[PDB]
Write a protein that binds this ligand. Structure first.
Ligand SMILES: NC(=O)C1=CN([C@@H]2O[C@H](COP(=O)(O)OP(=O)(O)OC[C@H]3O[C@@H](n4cnc5c(N)ncnc54)[C@H](O)[C@@H]3O)[C@@H](O)[C@H]2O)C=CC1
Ligand SMILES: Cc1cc2nc3c(=O)[nH]c(=O)nc-3n(C[C@H](O)[C@H](O)[C@H](O)COP(=O)(O)O)c2cc1C
Ligand code: SF4
Ligand code: SF4
Ligand code: SF4
Ligand code: FES
Ligand code: FES
Lengths: 73, 139, 227, 226, 442, 156
């Protein structure tokens, strides 16, 4: 159900802890330092929102914004 | 015609047999996507309807299922009797290679159904489960 | 007055609209530009049904439910082939240039465009060309502006001008580079600009106060209260 | 006795539609077993609402075709927008189905009051005194609204309005500070010119910090430039 | 015929037109039987009598739809408390291939002034607005000079010829949009709004400009009526043996030997106009297609060139007459590029009101660009056909989109092979994610 | 810091006299400002809204709706070549390539001298006279690619 391929299920199964309270994995226990089973995908290259390093009209299959005041008909 | 179409199954000869036996009235045929003919039988006719189904030339010999349903929150009930609860009996005839469904409507004040274990002895655990999970009592 | 929907008789008002008569009966007709408190226009063409002349008629004619009176003796059809595929084409046209940013959008499970895209049953895409974009505006501390999400059903400008009497919002531009907003950057000085969050069926006008500390609609624990 | 109608707005806590309560949250309420997991992995019992007709979980009822007047939220299958309210009404754009919340509690009297003979005189401006006129900004004249952190950028700066003739008499130009004394406290506020105001009056935004709403209709002294 | 002879009996419009392409001013207009119809209307005829006279004379509207103007003038309200009626002249024409009003506005302005006078007295309208375009500028100067000369010579003002009827005329030069020619959008633009059209059956005849009863009529429509009230009624019905009464400014345009504009009676075949008045094709062109009306109607082949240029005769040919200004396309020009230019004009010149035109004409533009560049994918011609079927009358808010997609319909129906030849590369809408198995279907 | 001149304000009021509403005179007021100053600046919208009474959003919508109301600074002369179909058959692409070669600009752009602004036009309404192009209220017909530098060099 992830439309960004952010949450993934690794082939690692070596879990099991002493306390149940420590089984609640926070954000620092989940975010890994690389792209996993879907390496090359990036959701923000499809989204049309203004992004640090991505102006309006810079996403895939997306045109540059024509100004509302533009001279062309 | 697609296999998922909402069919009424009035072309089933068991419906014609029921119309010949108990009259064209006294039961309501429901058009569902279950693939089986579903008939709403009144409570006092249930034992004799089951007895008639058990004495057909190719009778309905196995009680496939028997369970209740809470109709109190069901908003989309068109072509259905006024029911607070319902009890459905799913019966299978192997010689006909067909199956029928028998729905009995119930009100809140009288959740009493005549027992079905005198006809199908596997109904004991199904009626116990209906009395456990629902409030339906079997006489 | 009585009407016939899908060969079924219904007793509706004769002095009201056909779209609101059908929606009052629990029937589902998609709509974008119509609001119960703003009247009816033709800014979209989403409420299309097929109207006949008499009881025995096959061809019909595609009319708008929000622009046809619900007079006595009308014979309309909602879920025939032609009206359904035309409404699918209209949501396809509206979603032809729509940004692929639903999970990062403020509407999410509150969006009317999502419900009317699912309701028309349009999932596959055959539009392979480029989309359309617009620059955003700073509308103040309460209204976040994301103009790319717009489908140009004119409900915001109609509410803000005709209903609310405000002098800030408006329509600019032309055929396809149409714009809905202020002539400059600034705060919407009308006292009813917050209703644009739910008046807009898309994520253009959204709640900035809910943009900060945001959750989806299904995650909200609601209660009926008094302001 | 005159408040006897408040047991008609909503039914008792022992009110159920087909035996069940009404849900405060939707059926797709996510993350129930990890919501409180940062402080206790053991999921606590749900809060018990004995006061009212509502349950704090999703195990309730929010059906549009349910015999009730008060709806927590509008949701219908296929209608996830705020346009799901039309499923909760008998006719759309009209009254809500099965009535409306809240009863009127007031009945019109058979006979009216008398003609109030007390007609006030004209407002004559007086030297050395100023009549305070309320302005009542929407975003700044409510006690619970100013404490909201998002309103603080929306309220205007604390100001005071003066007539052009009054400002010419005081010799103060618009935008500069003026000092006025009330309850023995000389406070300085920036002035602005009000064209529609009248002579002998001064204008204040009520409800703000330091400016009470009861200051309307009161007098003011010592309008001196700071 | 090789030489054209124009007489007032057979050419009611441009018999007084000057050969040196110079404007006919007031003295030359009244010398060549000027303001006789206005005199008869304002002296000896009741306004209802004039309305019924135009109704039985069969002056159908020359805007392009062919609605009878007697019906339009008869649907004005009968209430005497509504005395703020308006008359509007749709002088804005921005349809490609249509230039019929430029001639009558540049070198015959007093004919339009007299027609507006007669129509305003027939409708009891106290104000008239010539809604012009920003590109007709010499026409604007000529119209303003004609208005000044008329209001100097006792016309067009107050107490006209001692009748007591007050009428005054303005020229409203538009700021430039193709949608402004539609009568409801003309009303919205005249009110200085964005020129989005309005919805019928609240008609301009009952509630138009500023809520008052108005009517909008073309320049040709208002220019035929002085001939009706100056020459006669049965004369107007007896100039052509067809049920489309009157004369129309016909003419071919586009790479012909003599492109121009000639007044001809209805029922004249398009082959006659092309091979006689237009001179036919030049040396090397084969005349592979034509449109009856410029750019709004749909293409016809050589077999439809023999039909008379009438509303109903071209109606049964899967087409319509339109402005009756024929548009000729030769064999050397690709139909894909021509329909691409048509769709580009209709996409960029439409208004921004309703969904299907707004978001289907640019899609047609992009599909036709792909067909131009040879980047066509399988499923584009069927998309264009579905687009044409879903942009017909009634499906959109106004009639811009059906007139836009009629050339597409005729290009698909007749010249299909070039559209098939525009498709070369296979369908690819989605690209790989490299971690997800694609849903490849058969 | 936009300020309407006396002649502009008198023209706007005189056009206001001709209609039942100043809103009807909004479009002609925008045309007067465009004629006087070449284009409509940002403060002119508020100036028209102040002299009329209608909101500035309506004035901005009117200014951005119609094609020949320029909201960007244009050159001293606006070249307007016909983009329509009859001029496509007669050939407008040759004269467009000639204009692009002579001016070294694209349509929608202006030259670095601030002299010419190249734009397409919906339709000139002179289709029977070959290719068509309008410069500064002057139409030109029967155009050829070789006649473009001669026709361009007689303007200021
Ligand atoms: N430059 C030009 O001359 C152009 C002409 N056209 C033509 O415009 C036509 C489409 O124009 P529309 O106004 O949308 O079509 P239409 O046929 O609905 O209306 C044309 C006229 O008929 C009148 N009318 C029709 N039915 C009426 C009724 N029941 N009651 C009162 N009045 C009634 C309208 O008021 C209007 O004046 C097309 O035939 C097209 O050829 C289109 C584009 C450009
Ligand atoms: C999109 C559109 C554009 C139109 N443009 C013009 C036009 O430029 N000139 C014109 O006379 N009629 C135009 N019309 C037709 C008008 O709606 C109307 O029929 C005409 O102005 C007057 O009708 P008449 O023929 O009875 O005089 C247009 C219609 C539409 C739908
Ligand atoms: S901004 Fe929203 S309300 Fe306004 S036209 Fe666009 S989709 Fe409709
Ligand atoms: S407004 Fe657009 S981007 Fe946002 S949820 Fe709706 S469809 Fe998706
Ligand atoms: S069809 Fe619709 S969008 Fe197109 S010009 Fe007409 S009203 Fe405008
Ligand atoms: S809801 Fe009827 S056309 Fe928009
Ligand atoms: S097509 Fe160019 S002038 Fe009309």
């Amino acid at each position: 159900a992830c439309p960004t391929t952010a949450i993934q299920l690794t082939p690692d199964f070596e879990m099991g802890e002493y306390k149940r309270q420590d089984l609640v994995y926070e954000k620092e226990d989940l975010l890994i330092s690389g792209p996993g089973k879907y390496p090359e995908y990036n959701f923000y290259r499809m989204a049309g929102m203004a992004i640090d390093g991505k102006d309006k009209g810079e996403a895939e299959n997306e045109a540059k914004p024509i100004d509302v005041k533009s001279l062309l008909p | 015609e697609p296999a998922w179409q909402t069919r009424d199954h009035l072309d089933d000869p068991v419906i014609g047999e029921l119309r010949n036996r108990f009259g064209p009235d006294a039961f309501t045929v429901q058009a569902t996507r279950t693939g089986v003919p579903v008939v709403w039988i009144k409570r006092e006719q249930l034992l004799e309807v089951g007895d008639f189904l058990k004495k057909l030339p190719k009778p309905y010999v196995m009680l496939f299922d028997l369970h209740g349903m809470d109709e109190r929150l069901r908003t989309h009930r068109e072509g259905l009797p006024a029911a607070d609860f319902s009890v459905f009996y799913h019966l299978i005839s192997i010689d006909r290679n067909r199956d029928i469904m028998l729905k009995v409507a119930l009100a809140e004040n009288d959740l009493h159904v005549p027992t079905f274990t005198k006809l199908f002895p596997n109904a004991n655990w199904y009626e116990r489960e209906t009395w456990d999970l629902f409030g339906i009592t079997f006489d | 007055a009585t009407i016939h929907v899908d060969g079924k008789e219904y007793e509706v008002n004769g002095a009201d609209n056909l779209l609101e008569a059908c929606l009052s009966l629990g029937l589902d007709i998609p709509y974008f530009c119509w609001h119960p408190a703003l009247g009816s226009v033709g800014a979209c063409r989403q409420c299309a049904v097929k109207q006949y002349q008499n009881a025995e008629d096959t061809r019909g004619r595609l009319v708008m439910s929000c622009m046809t009176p619900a007079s006595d003796g009308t014979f309309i059809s909602i879920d025939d082939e032609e009206a359904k595929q035309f409404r699918e084409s209209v949501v396809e046209w509206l979603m032809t240039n729509h940004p692929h940013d639903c999970p990062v959008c403020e509407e999410g499970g509150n969006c009317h465009l999502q419900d009317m895209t699912v309701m028309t049953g349009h999932s596959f895409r055959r539009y392979r060309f480029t989309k359309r974009t617009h620059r955003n505006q700073d509308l103040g501390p309460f209204i976040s502006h994301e103009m790319n999400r717009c489908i140009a059903c004119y409900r915001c400008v109609r509410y803000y001008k005709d209903y609310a009497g405000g002098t800030d919002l408006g329509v600019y531009g032309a055929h396809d580079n149409v714009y809905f907003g202020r002539p400059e950057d600034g705060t919407l000085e009308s006292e009813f600009s917050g209703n644009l969050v739910e008046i807009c069926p898309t994520g253009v006008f959204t709640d900035k106060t809910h943009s900060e500390r945001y959750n989806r609609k299904w995650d909200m624990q609601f209660a009926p209260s008094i302001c | 006795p005159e408040l006897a109608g408040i047991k008609d707005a909503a039914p008792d806590a022992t009110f159920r539609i087909r035996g069940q309560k009404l849900a405060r949250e939707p059926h797709r309420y996510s993350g129930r077993t990890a919501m409180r997991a940062n402080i206790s992995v053991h999921e606590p019992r749900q809060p018990q609402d004995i006061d009212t007709m509502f349950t704090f979980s999703m195990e309730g009822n929010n059906q549009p075709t349910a015999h009730r007047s008060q709806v927590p939220f509008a949701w219908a299958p296929g209608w996830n927008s705020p346009q799901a309210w039309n499923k909760f009404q008998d006719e759309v754009g009209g009254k809500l189905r099965f009535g409306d919340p809240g009863v009127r509690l007031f009945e019109t009297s058979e006979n009216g009051l008398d003609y109030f003979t007390s007609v006030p005189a004209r407002f004559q401006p007086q030297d050395g005194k100023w009549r305070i006129a309320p302005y009542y900004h929407l975003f700044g004249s409510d006690e619970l609204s100013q404490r909201a952190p998002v309103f603080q950028s929306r309220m205007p700066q604390p100001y005071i309005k003066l007539n052009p003739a009054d400002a010419a008499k005081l010799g103060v130009n618009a935008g500069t500070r003026v000092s006025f004394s009330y309850d023995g406290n000389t406070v300085t506020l920036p002035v602005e010119i009000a064209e529609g105001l009248t002579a002998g009056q001064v204008g204040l935004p009520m409800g703000m910090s330091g400016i009470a709403p009861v200051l309307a209709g009161a007098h003011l002294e010592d309008l001196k430039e700071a | 015929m090789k030489n054209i002879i124009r007489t007032p009996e057979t050419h009611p419009l441009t018999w007084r037109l000057r050969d040196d392409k110079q404007p006919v001013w007031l003295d030359e207009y009244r010398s060549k039987n000027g303001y006789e119809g206005a005199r008869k209307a304002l002296t000896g005829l009741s306004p209802d009598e004039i309305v019924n006279q135009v109704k039985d004379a069969g002056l159908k509207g020359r805007g392009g739809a062919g609605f009878s103007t007697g019906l339009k003038w008869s649907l004005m309200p009968k209430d005497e408390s509504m005395n703020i009626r308006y008359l509007l002249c749709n002088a804005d024409e921005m349809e490609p291939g249509t230039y019929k009003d430029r001639l009558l506005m540049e070198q015959l302005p007093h004919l339009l002034v007299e027609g507006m006078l007669i129509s305003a007295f027939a409708l009891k309208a106290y104000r008239g607005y010539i809604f012009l375009r920003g590109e007709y500028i010499e026409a604007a100067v000529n119209l303003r000079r004609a208005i000044a000369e008329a209001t100097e010579a006792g016309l067009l003002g107050k107490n006209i010829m001692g009748t007591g009827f007050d009428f005054e005329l303005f020229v409203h030069t538009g700021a430039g949009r193709y949608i402004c020619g539609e009568e409801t959008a003309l009303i919205n633009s005249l009110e200085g709004r964005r020129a989005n059209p309005r919805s019928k059956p609240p008609f301009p005849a009952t509630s138009g400009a500023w809520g008052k009863p108005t009517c909008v009529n073309n320049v040709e429509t208002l220019c035929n009526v002085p001939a009706i009230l100056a020459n006669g009624v049965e004369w107007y019905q007896n100039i052509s043996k067809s049920k489309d009464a009157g004369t129309k400014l016909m003419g071919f345009s586009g790479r012909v030997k003599n492109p121009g504009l000639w007044e001809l009676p209805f029922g004249t075949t398009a082959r006659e106009i092309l091979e006689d008045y237009a001179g036919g094709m030049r040396d090397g062109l084969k005349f592979k297609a034509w449109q009856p009306g410029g750019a709004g109607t749909d293409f016809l082949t050589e077999a439809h060139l023999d039909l008379p240029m009438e509303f109903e005769s071209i109606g049964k040919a899967g087409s319509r007459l339109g402005t009756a200004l024929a548009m000729a396309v030769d064999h050397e020009i690709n139909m894909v590029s021509l329909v691409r230019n048509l769709e580009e004009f209709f996409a960029r010149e439409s208004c921004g009101w309703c969904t299907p035109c707004r978001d289907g004409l640019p899609w047609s533009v992009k599909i036709l660009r792909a067909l131009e560049r040879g980047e066509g994918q399988p499923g584009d011609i069927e998309t264009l056909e579905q687009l044409c079927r879903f942009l017909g009358p009634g499906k959109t808010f106004c009639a811009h989109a059906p007139g836009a997609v009629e050339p597409l319909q005729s290009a698909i129906k007749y010249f299909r092979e070039e559209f098939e030849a525009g498709i070369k590369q296979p369908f690819s809408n989605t690209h790989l994610i490299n971690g997800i198995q694609p849903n490849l279907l058969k | 810091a936009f300020e309407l001149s006396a002649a502009e304000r008198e023209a706007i009021e005189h056009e206001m006299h001709h209609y039942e509403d100043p809103r009807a005179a909004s479009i002609e007021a925008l045309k007067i400002v465009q004629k006087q100053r070449g284009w409509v600046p940002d403060g002119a919208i508020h100036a028209i809204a102040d002299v009329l009474g209608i909101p500035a959003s309506d004035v901005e919508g009117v200014a951005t709706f119609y094609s020949q109301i320029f909201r960007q600074p244009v050159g001293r002369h606006v070249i307007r070549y016909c983009d329509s179909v009859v001029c496509h058959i007669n050939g407008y692409q040759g004269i467009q390539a000639a204009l692009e070669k002579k001016l070294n600009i694209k349509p929608g752009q202006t030259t670095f001298d601030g002299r010419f602004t190249l734009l397409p036009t919906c339709c000139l309404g002179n289709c029977d006279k070959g290719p068509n192009m309008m410069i500064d209220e002057d139409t030109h017909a029967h155009l050829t690619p070789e006649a473009i530098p001669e026709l361009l060099e007689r303007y200021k």
